[PDB]
Amino acid sequence: ALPDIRDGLKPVQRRILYSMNKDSNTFDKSYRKSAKSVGNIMGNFHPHGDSSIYDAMVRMSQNWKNREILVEMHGNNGSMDGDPPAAMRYTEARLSEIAGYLLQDIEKKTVPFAWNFDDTEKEPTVLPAAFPNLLVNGSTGISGYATDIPPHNLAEVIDAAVYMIDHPTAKIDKLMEFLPGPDFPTGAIIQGRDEIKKAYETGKGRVVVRSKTEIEKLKGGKEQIVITEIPYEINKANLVKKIDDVRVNNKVAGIAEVRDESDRDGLRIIELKKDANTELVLNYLFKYTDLQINYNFNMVAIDNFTPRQVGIVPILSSYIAHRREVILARSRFDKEKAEKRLHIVEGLIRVISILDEVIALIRASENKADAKENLKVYDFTEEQAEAIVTLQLYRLTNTDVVVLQEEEAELREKIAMLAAIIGDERTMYNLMKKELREVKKKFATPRLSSL
Amino acid sequence: ALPDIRDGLKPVQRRILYSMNKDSNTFDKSYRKSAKSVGNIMGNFHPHGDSSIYDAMVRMSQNWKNREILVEMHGNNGSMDGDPPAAMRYTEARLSEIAGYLLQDIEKKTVPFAWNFDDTEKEPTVLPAAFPNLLVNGSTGISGYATDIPPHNLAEVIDAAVYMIDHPTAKIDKLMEFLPGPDFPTGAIIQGRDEIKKAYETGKGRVVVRSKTEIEKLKGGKEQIVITEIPYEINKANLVKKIDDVRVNNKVAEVRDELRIAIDANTELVLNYLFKYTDLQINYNFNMVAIDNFTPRQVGIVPILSSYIAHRREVILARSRFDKEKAEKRLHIVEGLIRVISILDEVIALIRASENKADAKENLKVYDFTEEQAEAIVTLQLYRLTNTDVVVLQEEEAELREKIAMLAAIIGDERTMYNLMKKELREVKKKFATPRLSSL
């Protein structure tokens, strides 16, 4: 129904990503039959029919719907036009590269896990989210009428966040220098800058999305308008007809013929004029048809359990808060994982010094425990002595003692790095900035749609 | 459409077992959700609608349908009467112990496999079967007219099987000293002995089944007829109803239901009427057909059991070939592991003198250690250098030696192999046998 301020995902979308991730259906590995996926998604999680899940998978696999795709589909997923997808038995899919970042650090006991629908598995309430998916991909939902969060540019949302990490009480106008307004994957041209401001602090506003119309003059002293990109959600199926209905049922000037020059390597459309036709005709196509239409914002996401009208300021302020809980947890999990390893490695350094004495001690024993409990002499532990008896002959070679010497150093510096992030939160916030720029530099794509 | 002679299963029934076993949903373990079972069976093996799979899976868990059930269901799947089941949402299931005996030796490269409906995975063409599910559980379908194979007693089928192993040219009469007729999980009594024999040699037979009717003479000379068990495939929902339609439009001389149906100086001719005009006594028709060579074939007792014995030998011959090679690929390793504990210090003090793992394996020209054998030495645990974990390595050498020696004998003589079959079938009989219901 509605997404939450943190990961920006609606319930169904989250189950999809987690399922496909659990089954190891990632970007680097081979595509999987959607029928199997939707079969594991419905069987273990989300039961509300098959045709509710595959519906979501296909939306996430459309670059013309989401700014940065979350699912990658091979087969009929639909075209830039109002074209339909084939059934689940006929397509194969996997996750995108970037989707792996929403799920990155899940194993580290970072996010809260809730109990399954039929109480069998365990599923995440939120995904760790290495990027702010809420502004990046947007949302359309339930709640009164219908919510509308528009998609923004990945790179621009990152900059805004990095600014608000250092400046918590950041004024809305400053943020607008990093994220000036929305960025639609369908392009277009957004107007009303003073109206976008209202959308950013409160959540409502009207903006008007014009199409990037380019005029190129042809033979016989005539002109001819060509639409390079039409607005978001709006299809060129019945809009191409709505423009033809103005000439066939003549309401203006020299509107001659309307021909759709489709999309292959680009969108192309209106051979207007034939000889001396006004461009005041263009204003009729704007005001009457959906060639230009108002996009109303209504930014609502679930906050702390309850739905709440939100703006750019608290969306980002709820994102940074989540990321710190995820990072503080990632670190706490690894500090423990690294201390548990260090101990064993320290004991493994000891058995390398008294090698020949410990060779005879294990040889002159009876069983495994008569080797483990016989390791009273240095003082080893249950897990440390376990680790010595369960060490192989190859680990006692030249290279495997040297690589083991460097693992100790690598481990002690990790614990040292990890203790700083937990101890001082100033440096934790600096890891957040570094990780997000590490994400920006890899997935940044320049903006479409003028302002 | 028709079951397979060898394992007595229809493609859907097989798919259920194979899918459930791979997902570790066996008897010893917990009852896994029915939705997940069907979901995996559909997504990986059978794409012909969910309600066709659950129905098959619900049938193999009803003790009023299959004699020795292959699926075990916790909750509502229907009672002894015509009581309806629940939905896949409200049930949970697993396989029964005896079902595991059909899948016994699956992974041992025993049975032929075939690719998926979408060429994604591998599914078996037949199960390795340790008991003849064709006679033991039967089948009712459509193959011409309708195909019908009745359920029989496990023990009696095994006795007949062991005789057929020892006497290939077995006569139908001698065979009926072991297997005297069908055994329905509903009870009753089967008449027409020579008609059972007609079925066992040809495939078709009209025998007539009758109910178990005992007399209950109550208070003041008044009598009442009590039915203990009604015949097979006959529901008592319509039968108790048609025995009410006879007293309403009185064609004879009350009726209550408790399996127990209870019916002044009325004659014992009502019993004879109710036998001829209702389904309390009906003609059961045999029509034993199954897929042999990839085509339906009308089959008698002898060629059913012949196809079974012929199957069981290839399973065993293939099981033994798998295991002889496994124990050969392991003895070769063990022999090197004893050759090293004799020159203990020389191997420890050579590996330490080496660079890496592979440079230590190449240094094993100290007698001549092979690739797979050298892998085991460098990847050997330090706990395997203690007395008890070296003593067992001498017993292992001996076990592997006696295993190969025992196995090699089974493959080299098609006589001692048959003796292993008889043995195995007798092991199964000893464990799952149950006294027979119904009579002659």
Longest dimension (CA), chain B: 106
Cβ pair B226, B214 in contact under 8 A: yes
Compute φ and ψ for A94, nearest 5 degrees: -150, 180
**Identity of the residue in B47, B377, B382 whose CB atom sits nearest the CB atom of A89:** B47
- Which residues of chain B make contact with A19, given a CB cutoff of 8 A? none
Q: Mutating which of B386, B388, B392, B393 best tests the A interface, going by the most A Cβ atoms within 10 A?
A: B386
Query: What is the distance in angstroms between the Cα of A74 and the nearest Cα belonging to chain B?
Result: 16
**Identity of the residue in A89, A390, A397 whose CB atom sits nearest the CB atom of B354:** A397
Query: What is the distance in angstroms between the Cα of A38 and the nearest Cα belonging to chain B?
Result: 9
Query: What is the distance in angstroms between the Cα of B349 and the nearest Cα belonging to chain A?
Result: 10
Q: Look up tokens 């005539």; give the residue.
A: A222
Q: Look up tokens 């791979």; give the residue.
A: B22
CA gap A416, B54 in Å, rounded: 57
Cβ pair B239, B278 in contact under 8 A: yes
Compute φ and ψ for A328, nearest 5 degrees: -65, -35
CA gap B282, B285 in Å, rounded: 10
Cβ pair B323, B108 in contact under 8 A: yes
Contact A368 B383 (CB under 8 A): yes
Compute φ and ψ for A390, nearest 5 degrees: -100, 40
CA gap A389, A372 in Å, rounded: 7
CA gap B311, B102 in Å, rounded: 13
Give me the torsion for CA of B350, B353, B355, B361, rounded to 10°: 0
Contact B389 A400 (CB under 8 A): no
CA gap B66, B88 in Å, rounded: 20
Would you call A288 a catalytic residue per the annotation? no
Among A90, A101, A200, A319, the one annotated catalytic: A90
Cβ pair B104, B128 in contact under 8 A: yes
Rounded (10°) angle between helices A398-423 and A312-353 = 140
- Which residues of chain B make contact with A36, given a CB cutoff of 8 A? 43-44, 120
Order of strands across the sheet with B148-149?
Answer: B139-140, B148-149, B285-287, B204-206
Helix, strand, coil distribution of chain B in percent, nearest 5 = 45, 15, 45
Instruction: Please state, in angstroms and as integers, the Cα–Cα distance from residue A218 to each residue in A197, A244, A260, A273, B121, following that order.
Output: 41, 20, 17, 10, 60
**Identity of the residue in B360, B378, B386 whose CB atom sits nearest the CB atom of A362:** B386
Range B173-178, long-range pairs (CB < 8 A, 24+ positions): B173/B197, B175/B200, B175/B301, B175/B302, B176/B200
Contact residues of B toward A, CB < 8 A: 33, 35-36, 39-40, 42-44, 47, 118, 120, 344, 347-348, 351-352, 354-357, 359-360, 377-383, 385-389
Task: Specify burial of residue B330 (Cβ count, 10 A radius: 0-12, 13-18, 19+).
Answer: middle
Task: Tell me how far the alpha carbon of residue A226 is from its chain's centroid.
Answer: 34
How many alpha carbons fall within 13 Å on the CB side of residue B220?
1
CA gap A405, A335 in Å, rounded: 20
CA gap B211, A425 in Å, rounded: 84
- The amino acid sitting at B205 is G
Method for this entry: X-ray
**Identity of the residue in A371, A398, A399 whose CB atom sits nearest the CB atom of B383:** A371
For B89-138, give the secondary structure using H, E and C: CCCEEEECHHHCCCCCCHHHHHCCEEECCCCCCEEECCCCCCCCHHHHCC
| DSSP state string for B139-190 | EE-------EE----HHHHHHHHHHHHH-TT--HHHHTTT--S---TT--EE
Q: Mutating which of A393, A402, A404 best tests the B interface, going by the most B Cβ atoms within 10 A?
A: A393
Among B18, B31, B54, B90, the one annotated catalytic: B90
- Per DSSP, which regions of A230-314 are E strands? 292-293, 296-298, 300-303, 306-309
Tokens of A402: 């040297």
Q: Is B281 helix (H, G, I), strand (E, B) or coil?
A: strand
Task: Specify burial of residue B100 (Cβ count, 10 A radius: 0-12, 13-18, 19+).
Answer: middle
Task: Specify burial of residue A285 (Cβ count, 10 A radius: 0-12, 13-18, 19+).
Answer: buried
- Which residues of chain A make contact with B383, given a CB cutoff of 8 A? 362, 368, 371, 389-390
Q: Which residues, at least 6 apart from B349, have a Cβ–Cβ distance to it below 8 Å?
A: none
**Identity of the residue in A355, A365, A394 whose CB atom sits nearest the CB atom of B379:** A394
Tokens of B427: 């092991």
Compute φ and ψ for A133, nearest 5 degrees: -50, -25
Range B353-362, long-range pairs (CB < 8 A, 24+ positions): B354/A397, B354/A398, B355/A397, B355/A398, B355/A399, B356/A394, B356/A397, B356/A398, B356/A399, B356/A400, B357/A394, B357/A397, B357/A400, B359/A397, B360/A393, B360/A394, B360/A397
Q: Is the dihedral of CA A164, A170, A171, A177 positive or negative?
A: negative
Helices vs. strands in chain A: H and E counts, helices first: 16, 16
Task: Specify burial of residue A352 (Cβ count, 10 A radius: 0-12, 13-18, 19+).
Answer: middle
Query: What is the distance in angstroms between the Cα of A12 and the nearest Cα belonging to chain B?
Result: 19
Q: Is the dihedral of CA A52, A57, A62, A67 positive or negative?
A: positive
Contact B33 A120 (CB under 8 A): yes
Cβ pair A98, A443 in contact under 8 A: yes
Contact A33 B118 (CB under 8 A): yes
Tokens of A344: 């064993």
- Which residues of chain B make contact with A403, given a CB cutoff of 8 A? none
**Identity of the residue in B36, B348, B387 whose CB atom sits nearest the CB atom of A366:** B387
- Which residues of chain B make contact with A33, given a CB cutoff of 8 A? 118, 120
Q: Look up tokens 């592991």; give the residue.
A: B337
Tokens of B129: 């079967």
Cβ pair A81, A235 in contact under 8 A: yes
Contact residues of A toward B, CB < 8 A: 33, 35-36, 39-40, 42-44, 89, 118, 120, 355, 359, 362-363, 365-368, 370-371, 388-394, 396-400
Contact A33 B357 (CB under 8 A): no
Q: Look up tokens 């007698």; give the residue.
A: B367
Task: Specify burial of residue A399 (Cβ count, 10 A radius: 0-12, 13-18, 19+).
Answer: middle
Query: What is the distance in angstroms between the Cα of A95 and the nearest Cα belonging to chain B?
Result: 19
- The amino acid sitting at A281 is V
Query: What is the distance in angstroms between the Cα of B63 and the nearest Cα belonging to chain A?
Result: 28
Cβ pair B70, B17 in contact under 8 A: yes
- Which residues of chain A make contact with B33, given a CB cutoff of 8 A? 118, 120
**Identity of the residue in A120, A365, A390 whose CB atom sits nearest the CB atom of B386:** A365
CA gap B309, B422 in Å, rounded: 10
**Identity of the residue in B39, B347, B356 whose CB atom sits nearest the CB atom of A399:** B356
- Per DSSP, which regions of A320-365 are E strands? none
Query: What is the distance in angstroms between the Cα of A94 and the nearest Cα belonging to chain B?
Result: 16
Resolution reached, in Å?
2.7
Contact A389 B382 (CB under 8 A): yes
Query: What is the distance in angstroms between the Cα of B388 and the nearest Cα belonging to chain A?
Result: 5
Q: Is A177 helix (H, G, I), strand (E, B) or coil?
A: coil
CA gap A26, A426 in Å, rounded: 34
Contact B379 A400 (CB under 8 A): no
- Which residues of chain A make contact with B379, given a CB cutoff of 8 A? 392-394
Q: Mutating which of B48, B383, B392 best tests the A interface, going by the most A Cβ atoms within 10 A?
A: B383
Contact A392 B386 (CB under 8 A): no
Q: Is A246 helix (H, G, I), strand (E, B) or coil?
A: helix
Instruction: Please state, in angstroms and as integers, the Cα–Cα distance from residue B233 to each residue in A232, B148, B282, B288, following that order.
Output: 63, 12, 11, 17
Give me the torsion for CA of A96, A101, A102, A105, rounded to 10°: 140
Q: Which residues, at least 6 apart from A176, have a Cβ–Cβ distance to it below 8 Å?
A: A196, A197, A200
Order of strands across the sheet with B256-257?
Answer: B212-217, B223-229, B261-262, B256-257
Phi/psi region, residue A207 (left: phi>0; alpha: psi -120 to 50; beta: rest), is: alpha
- The amino acid sitting at B304 is I
Q: Which residues, at least 6 apart from B200, have a Cβ–Cβ distance to it below 8 Å?
A: B172, B175, B176, B300, B301
Q: Is the dihedral of CA B220, B223, B229, B235 positive or negative?
A: negative
Other CB atoms within 10 A of residue A383 CB: 11
Contact A399 B360 (CB under 8 A): no
